[PDB]
Structures are given as structure tokens and as C-alpha cells.
Amino acid sequence: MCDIGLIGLAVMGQNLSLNISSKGFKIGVYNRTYERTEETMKRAKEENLVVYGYKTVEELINNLKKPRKVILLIKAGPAVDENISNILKHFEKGDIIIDGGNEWYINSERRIKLCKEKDVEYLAMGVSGGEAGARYGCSFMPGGSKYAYDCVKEILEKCSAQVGNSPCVTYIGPGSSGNYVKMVHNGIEYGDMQLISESYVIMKHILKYDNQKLSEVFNKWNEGILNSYLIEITANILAKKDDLTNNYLVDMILDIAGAKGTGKWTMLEATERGIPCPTMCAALDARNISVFKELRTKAESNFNKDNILIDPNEDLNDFENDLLNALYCCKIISYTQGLFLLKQVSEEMNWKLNLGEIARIWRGGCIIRAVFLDRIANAYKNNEKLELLFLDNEFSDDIKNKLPSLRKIVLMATKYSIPIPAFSASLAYFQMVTSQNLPLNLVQAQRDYFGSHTYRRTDREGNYHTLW
Amino acid sequence: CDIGLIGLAVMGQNLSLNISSKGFKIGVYNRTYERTEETMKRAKEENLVVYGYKTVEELINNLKKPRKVILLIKAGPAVDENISNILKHFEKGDIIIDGGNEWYINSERRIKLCKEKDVEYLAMGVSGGEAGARYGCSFMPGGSKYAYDCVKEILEKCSAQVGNSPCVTYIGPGSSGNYVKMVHNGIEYGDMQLISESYVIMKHILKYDNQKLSEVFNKWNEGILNSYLIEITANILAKKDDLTNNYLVDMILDIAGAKGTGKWTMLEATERGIPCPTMCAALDARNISVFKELRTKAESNFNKDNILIDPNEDLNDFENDLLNALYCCKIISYTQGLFLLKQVSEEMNWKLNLGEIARIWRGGCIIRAVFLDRIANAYKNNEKLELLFLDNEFSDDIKNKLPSLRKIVLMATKYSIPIPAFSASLAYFQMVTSQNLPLNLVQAQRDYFGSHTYRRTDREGNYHTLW
């Protein structure tokens, strides 16, 4: 009998089947269409690995050992519920359903409760790493049934990314906390990608760096404090040559990058729960504005943007490293908004997430994997109740040392009419969070004028209204 | 009686006084009759006759056919199963108009539920507070044109009338009326944020005292920034406290949460993929202010040095650069607001006429301005206008006044003054007007780690690369 079952063989579950078999476990498999079930065992016997193939979902359910554990990697839709309903027919008490797809967390909380209304235990697990992380080591974020995580952890611990000793797996928490963490993960991924793209345009359009020089600076930044998966791949991307022309491949890609849904979700949670995430607002704005490509062409023909002529006595020494410090400053700020949202929702949902180990599971396999997340993990284990992360003593010293660089990057781009909303929002976010008095006294005074919303006073309690 | 009104609350109270002032007669009902009692007291004070009722059954039958009922009770489960209960006494051809500020999707359920009984439903957003009630509202009725047809004249003569042309229009089908009202206050949230950032730029860079600030705002209200918010801001900043020796605005605690209204339009922007950065900054400022005891702890750790401005900093004409900068951000703010309206109008197939929407906003609103009459002039000149600052009127204003926006952002950034709405407004403009954006690197990244296909400059088809 098999140890684990896996429904849904895309480019993501296939390689997870190979990983599970590569680590001493052997897996059962089912797909709606059987050509991909055909292709998977093809690659299994190629790599000298055994994977059992099945045509109906019933034969594989009966070919697992109790408690039966099944993983789903099918796309979000009614298909998730037609699989889960039909798995429930054959499943009995104590059996485990593990959803690995990126699903809206409210959907999971609904399905955890329907499935335990049959005492079928549900594990909503977010997976990150793509199809490289699948095959060799991803970042697992399982949440929901603590019982189900305990019976399957051993499969996850040896199939995840190993940072030294540490497997990139941890019990996230109860309910749909697994999808919420993974959702916040791609929110921080969207912001990291936007900040990198804005650093790319500062060097190319102010220091007027060619595409290879940009690849070197990213290969030099990747050697450092911002050593990350995304920074290293930009160095590779910027150096890549097209095979149809003699140009760099990135320069021939049309600048339309829409939102694929997941990352969009984090801004909805931010808005409705009242937790600001400005770095992510700029990231979604950049993606959404790019979609109107033929409106932006008409707009530029009316508002022609001139080539960037830099002042001859503008000083640009250390600007490459000021952008270094600025980018690192904006990443500290970007994670601060993400983890503050996680912390707050953790308290409202009563999940009591451990952000120290969430940072530690994210050190490998995922898209945002960086040495930076080891500083975060060490920060929260030093202070387990830290709300904002740059309030940590080391991080606060990093902000105070590198914030002038962020000011000068925003100043230089502002003067030369280069838009970097993520950089501007990140420094705007810091200046408002760290200010005791904000101009919302005038707003509260305005609302009382026309709407009688009442206001509160500095020196006394109670709500007051005045005829101005 | 000509019209009945079943939930007046504190707001329909004042609506009855106006409706009777112009030759019509109103029936009235409240859940609790202490307020229907109070309504007639003010009715006979102002010398008009208004009918009061205690049960819902007696009031429905006292109007001429087809009987039309208005509801102005707050959003909740009470309104929607009430709609099960109003359906009880109403028959076909009756007109039900919801005037409460309601989520447009919540309405869309009831228009189609009511058309399942051949009772046509009008989701109408009302603005003006209860001053708009007595003297003039901004009516935004949408849904069934037939249902708008029986109440049309009642709205035309009871709204805020700019001369003779009424601030009422058939907005469109479905819940289009509520969506206009929602997007309207979205621009209201952004206008307040842009003004509040102008207030702190003058206070902390030019060291303007509250009286100098009131004069500049009263001097902006005389010019291109003639608006209701600019005029009341001049009054607010000049008002003196009677409890202490300070200005009243300086003794108000800086915590201003969102009451729902502005929060909703940002949800639509995110879910439909229409960027509204000016509105994003407005909600960010409000949401950050609620963490007042976190902002105090953060400031103690990040001591802020006093704003010591360079003695050789040039600040002459800075007051006029901020005028043009603030005006630039208003054009940009409305551009995102009307673009969202334009986009949702075609996604919902409402075929809204934003020229008439802008003209509906000439009276009654918090956002009243002569500025939006020029907006109406833009759409009347080009009904297919995509973005509003691409119009020739605004484009020449933008091209003349955008340099002022650059130096305002530069000066605040230099002295660490946070102006998220100003920074977003100038970022939004530079990207909307850029043919090539750095999102080619993003598409290359997604194809790298996620194997998402991409499109090319010079050719069709979807491509994937082994990088």
C-alpha cells in the first residue's frame, strides 16, 4: 500500500510526485485526463523511481494505508469541490485531505468545516517554489488540523528545501492560516519584484547603465545583504540574449504584466481589515497600469517624455550604493507591512502564528528566499510579540543608517521625472508610521463640519461637535 | 398624498420639509415614532402639512396610482427582508426607491428580485446630508427607466439646482446610482487627503500659523480651486477654541477612521484592476492614524529632528507652486475616479454619461466645484474621452502646472514631510503617460520561476524561454 496519494498532475504535482518518491516514499496518482498520468510514470522510470498510476480515484483511495493521506494540486474552482466531494465518498474517519493549491482562505475555512462534519481532517497547505521547488525542495506552509500535519510531516520534512539542518516546513496554525501565510508571501513577492524593477530603471535611466552592467550590479548585489532568488535571476535575465534578434531578451518583452489573482488578494484583505500596505499598492498599480498599453501609447504622444538629461554637476558618486541602501531599506519596510498584517489577522482570527519560524521556512525553496529572512527569524525569536519589525533594535539601526539613501534616491528620481511609486510609498509609509501627529485633525474637523461625525479632543475625553 | 416614505431616520426627516415646500405632500413612517413625532413638530413649525403614520399598512394606501415608496433606513438585514414585507402590500407598477448609501451588489440582488414580482426598483444614491434635504440634494437614480419616470419631476425640483438645470439624471440601469455615489465619495476621500497634505506642507516648511493657512485657503477658494472643502477648510483653520487658548483644529485628536464609504471604492479598484493611487494614499493616512499609540512608540524610537530648513533655500513662489501642485493632483484624482467609472460602466454595460454625472455633482456634494463643470465641458466636447487629463483643457493645465508638482514633492521629500497622495499622484501620471514601463523585467521573472508565457515587442504569439 502507498504512503501518500496525489490528485492533479500539472507541472507542479508531477515533480512533487517525483520528490516524494525520491525521498524513500512511494506515491499513488490520479488525473482527470490520463495522458499526464501516462507521462508521469514515464519520468518516474526514467529517473529510476517508482510511481504508481491509477485511472479512477477509487482504486488509489483503496491503495493507501490508513490513515489515508491525499494531496490535491488542482486549480481553484468548482473542480476542487467536485474532487473533495468525491474523495469524501470513499474516505472514512481519520483520513486526511491535503490541499496544496493557492486558494482563497475563506474557501478553505468553509471546506475544513464541511470535511470535519464527516470527521475527514483537512490540511490547507500553501506551497511555494514553483516546479523547481516541487522537484527538489519547496517551502511547505500547512495549516488546519494539527492531527493531519503530524501524520504527514515526515513526507514534508524530507521533500522541502533544507536550510542547513532546518527543513522549510512548520505547522502554520489552525483553520486556513496556511493559505493566508502563502497569500501574504506572494504579496511580499509582488512588492519585491516592483522594487527591483524600479532599481533597474534608476540605474538604466540616471546612471545610464547598459543591460550587461545592470546584470553585473545585480550579480554584485546578490553577493550581499540582499542575496535573494529574485535578485540573482534578474542578473541572469538582463544578460540573456534573444535568439531572433541581436538584442537583450528582456528588451524585446512587451511591458504587460497583469495580476494572476493570488497577489491581488492581499490588497483586498489589507483594505477591508484596515491595515495599510502601501508598497503592495504601488506594485498592483504598476501591474494594472501596464495592461492599458494602447492607452499609455496615446498618453505619451500627448505628454511626450523627454530623455533623461542629468545635470553635469549633479554628484552621482556612491549613488549605486545609495540605491543599494535604499533598496534594502524598502525591503525592511515592505516586510514590515506584510508581517504587521499577518500579526494583526493572527490576533483577530486567533491563529497565534509564529512569525519567527514562518520567516525560517521562507529562507529556502520559495520565490522570496533570501538571507534577509534569517535576520527576521532571529528578530522574532528575540522578541516573540514584536508588532512592527523595524522596531527591532538591529533593524532600527539599519533604518537609521540607510534611510538617507532612500531619501536621496527618491529625490533624484523625482527631479528627473522617473516614477518609482514603491520607493516613494515605502519612505512615505515610514514617515507616517513614525509620526505621532498626522494631519487627520483637519480631516476629523472636516467630517464634523458637513456630516456631524463628531471628533475627539487632545485634552479631554468624550466626543464633541461644534458649529464652525 | 403624492409620495410615501417609510424610513426617515434622522435624514428623511429633513427631506419631507423640502418636498412639501414645493407643492407636494408626503406620507411618513419610522420604526420608533418619537422621530416621526419630532418630524411633524418641525413641519408645522415651518408652516407645512405632513402625514404621520404608525403601521406600514395604513401609509401605503394613501397615495394615487401607481403608488411609489421610498426607503431611507440604514443598510442591514432589516432592509432586505423588509423588502419581503413591503412586497406584501404593493402591486405591479409600484415604484420602490432605496435612498440609503448601500453596497451596489447588495442592491443588484433586489432589483432582480423585485422584477420577479414586476415591481421595478430604483437604487438612488443621495448626497448633501440633511442640508441637501431641506434645500437641495444630488439625486443619482438608477435602474428601471420606467420607475425613474414616475418620480422624475419630484427629484428635478427638490435637488440642488444650479440655475434652472437640475442636478438629477437617469444614471443608468441596475445599481448604477449607488456606484456613482460610492465613487463620488472616493474622490471626496482623496480631495481631503490632498488638502490635508497641503496644510502640513505650509505649516512645517513655510511655518505658516493657522491664520496664514486660513487666508491662503480663502485665497485659493477665490480662484481655480473654488470648492466646498477649500472654503470650509479656511473656516476650520481660523476657528478658535473656547476651551483653551489654542485654535480648535490643534486640539482635535488625529484619529480619523473610515466609515465604510471610502473603503468600498478601493475594494472595487483592486478587484477590477483599476488603479486609484490617490485614493490608496487617502485610506492609508486614515488607517495609519488609528494606530495612534504605535505612532507614539515609533516616534520615540525614531526621534524626528525639527524641520530646520536651509537658510539659503528659495521659497518665494512656493505658495503658488503648491497651488498648482494641489490643482494638478485634483485633475489626476478625478481622472482615476472617472476612469474607474468608465471602466465599470462598460463592464456592467451601464452606458453611463459622465458628462451628466459631472454636472449632477455641481451642487449638493461635498466635492462641489466649478472645476467639475469644466469636467462636464470635456465630456460634452468628447463623449469618448478615455482619460480626463488627456483632454485639451486639462492637458494644457497639466503641462503648465506639473513642474510645480515636481518641486513640491522634491521639497517635502528633502525635509521628510510625508505626502503619499502627492507622491502617488505624480507617480500615477508619469506611468500612465509612459509607453514603456519596467514591467518587461517582471514578465521575464514570471517566465523564469513560474513558466508563465509572455508576448514580444515585434511579433505575435506566446513564448517561453529557457533562461
UniProtKB/TrEMBL annotation, chain A:
From what superkingdom does this record's organism come? Eukaryota
A Pfam family hit:
6PGD
Q: Which UniProt keywords apply?
A: Gluconate utilization, NADP, Nucleotide-binding, Oxidoreductase, Pentose shunt
Enzyme class, broadest EC rank: oxidoreductase
Q: Which reaction does it catalyse?
A: 6-phospho-D-gluconate + NADP(+) = D-ribulose 5-phosphate + CO2 + NADPH
Q: Which GO terms describe its cellular component?
A: cytosol
Q: Active-site positions, per UniProt?
A: K182 (proton acceptor), E189 (proton donor)
Where substrate binds, per the record, is at: N102, S128, G129, G130, H185, N186, Y190, K260, R287, R447, H453
Q: Tell me, in a sentence or two, what this protein's role is.
A: Catalyzes the oxidative decarboxylation of 6-phosphogluconate to ribulose 5-phosphate and CO(2), with concomitant reduction of NADP to NADPH.
**Family, per entry:** Belongs to the 6-phosphogluconate dehydrogenase family.
The protein's assembly and partners: Homodimer.
- Which named protein is this? 6-phosphogluconate dehydrogenase, decarboxylating
Q: What species was this sequence derived from? A: Plasmodium falciparum (isolate 3D7)
Automatic annotation (TrEMBL), chain B:
Query: In the record, what terms sit under GO molecular function?
Result: NADP binding; phosphogluconate dehydrogenase (decarboxylating) activity
Its annotated pathway? Answer: Carbohydrate degradation; pentose phosphate pathway; D-ribulose 5-phosphate from D-glucose 6-phosphate (oxidative stage): step 3/3
For the protein in the UniProt heading, the enzyme class is: oxidoreductase
* Keyword presence, NADP: yes
Keyword Transmembrane helix set for record: no
Q: Per UniProt, which keywords does this protein have?
A: Gluconate utilization, NADP, Nucleotide-binding, Oxidoreductase, Pentose shunt
Entry function: Catalyzes the oxidative decarboxylation of 6-phosphogluconate to ribulose 5-phosphate and CO(2), with concomitant reduction of NADP to NADPH.
- By what name is this protein known? 6-phosphogluconate dehydrogenase, decarboxylating
Q: What organism does the record attribute this protein to? A: Plasmodium falciparum (isolate 3D7)
Tell me the classification of the organism that encodes this protein.
Answer: Eukaryota, Sar, Alveolata, Apicomplexa, Aconoidasida
